[PDB]
């Protein structure tokens, strides 16, 4: 195609209002499903028109979350933007600061951070012989280290086909049906871990 459909729908919708319990860490989540590999982007504030790229098959369910780890001085609106092809949708959260605080407003919590996987694909459908790039994006201080598990659960080793990139993305090439399953991202740093499973299903053929 064509003129469409290229579609995009909200699987998990960020809540309209949150209250920041004092010295809280608030993680806002929006998840969406649509054609192609959509992209979620976060921006704070009220904006009219917007700018993401732009460098243009398959159906994908993507999750992305925004981590506020500091006490707010004033209310803030956090907007999640989803854009596959010529589509765009967005949902908004307004996060009220607490009534009173014993902490410095607008100062990132100090300390070690357990990994949080902030960007993962819950479901990835693409045609056999197609190359896929699954993401693990962590937000952990100290900086986390990514280990990828396949459907069997055996660790992944550099080779032809499966290959793990610098971004933490796992790139599987010229996929077969032998590859179908559930793939796991383990992000681990000095204080702990978080995990994500990316269901993959190669489709055929045509043939």
């Amino acid at each position: 195609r064509a003129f469409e459909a290229d579609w995009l729908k909200f699987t998990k919708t960020p809540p309209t209002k949150l209250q920041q319990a004092d010295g809280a860490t608030i993680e806002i989540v929006c998840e969406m499903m649509g054609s192609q590999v959509p992209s979620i982007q976060w921006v704070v504030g009220h904006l009219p028109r917007s700018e993401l790229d732009d460098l243009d098959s398959a159906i994908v369910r993507v999750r992305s979350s925004h981590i506020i780890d500091h006490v707010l001085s004033e209310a803030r609106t956090y907007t999640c933007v989803g854009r596959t092809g010529s589509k765009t949708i967005y949902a908004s959260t307004v996060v009220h600061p607490p009534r009173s605080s014993r902490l410095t407003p607008e100062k990132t919590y100090p300390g070690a951070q357990k990994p949080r996987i902030i960007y993962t694909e819950k479901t990835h459908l693409d045609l056999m012989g197609s190359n896929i790039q699954l993401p693990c994006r962590v937000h952990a201080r100290p900086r986390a280290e990514i280990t990828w598990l396949n459907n069997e659960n055996k660790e992944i080793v550099q080779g032809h086909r499966h290959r793990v990139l610098a971004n933490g993305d796992l790139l599987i090439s010229e996929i077969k049906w032998e590859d179908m399953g559930n793939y796991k991202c383990i992000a681990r740093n000095v204080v702990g871990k978080d995990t994500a499973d990316t269901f993959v299903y190669p489709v055929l053929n045509e043939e």
Binding site: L127, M128, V203, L204, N205, E206
Partner: peptide
């Protein structure tokens, strides 16, 4: 469905047929 597809590969066409 699952039995139809999971046991073997499914066409994109084939999956749509399942939709209500």
């Amino acid at each position: 469905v699952v039995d139809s597809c999971c046991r073997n590969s499914c066409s994109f066409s084939t999956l749509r047929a399942y939709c209500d």
